[PDB]
């Protein structure tokens, strides 16, 4: 029914790393992630995708949320497991696929991100954990959604 995905926010006390995809989600800033592979844990997939997409090596990951995405007329629900970290090693690498950039917390480019980010980023920035569901029509319109803070992701 649903397909496992990861999403990793490198969130430091004064800045967050985002990445701009050159070609799904192209032209938007987003966290780093993708599909989880066979025999791979969700956390291991999060570590892998962060390195593949940003060049960074993450030490400890922390689960901060789970977000299910529905795109009307698409059979697969995206079950996105959201992680946060402050302990990274390396420098963000720009590749032909991905352009990383640090943003000050007051300057997060919400107009150039997936529209769901405006809803749950304020929770992530105050260190709250959450479960969410977003129903999209196309890539730009949220038809409906639910979002609640949780003690256990």
Curated annotation (Swiss-Prot):
**Extent of motif Nudix box:** 34-55
Phenotypic consequence of residue 36 to E: Loss of activity
Q: In which tissues is it expressed?
A: Widely expressed with highest expression in thymus, testis, embryo and proliferating blood lymphocytes.
Q: What is the effect of changing residue 153 to A?
A: Slightly reduces 2-oxo-dATPase and 8-oxo-dGTPase activities and increases thermolability
Q: What is the effect of changing residue 116 to A/N?
A: Loss of 2-oxo-dATPase activity, reduces 8-oxo-dGTPase activity
What Enzyme Commission number(s) does the record list for this chain? 3.6.1.56, 3.6.1.-
Family per record: Belongs to the Nudix hydrolase family.
The protein's name? Oxidized purine nucleoside triphosphate hydrolase
User: What is the protein's species of origin?
Assistant: Homo sapiens (Human)
What taxonomic ancestry is recorded? Eukaryota, Metazoa, Chordata, Craniata, Vertebrata
What gene does this protein come from? NUDT1
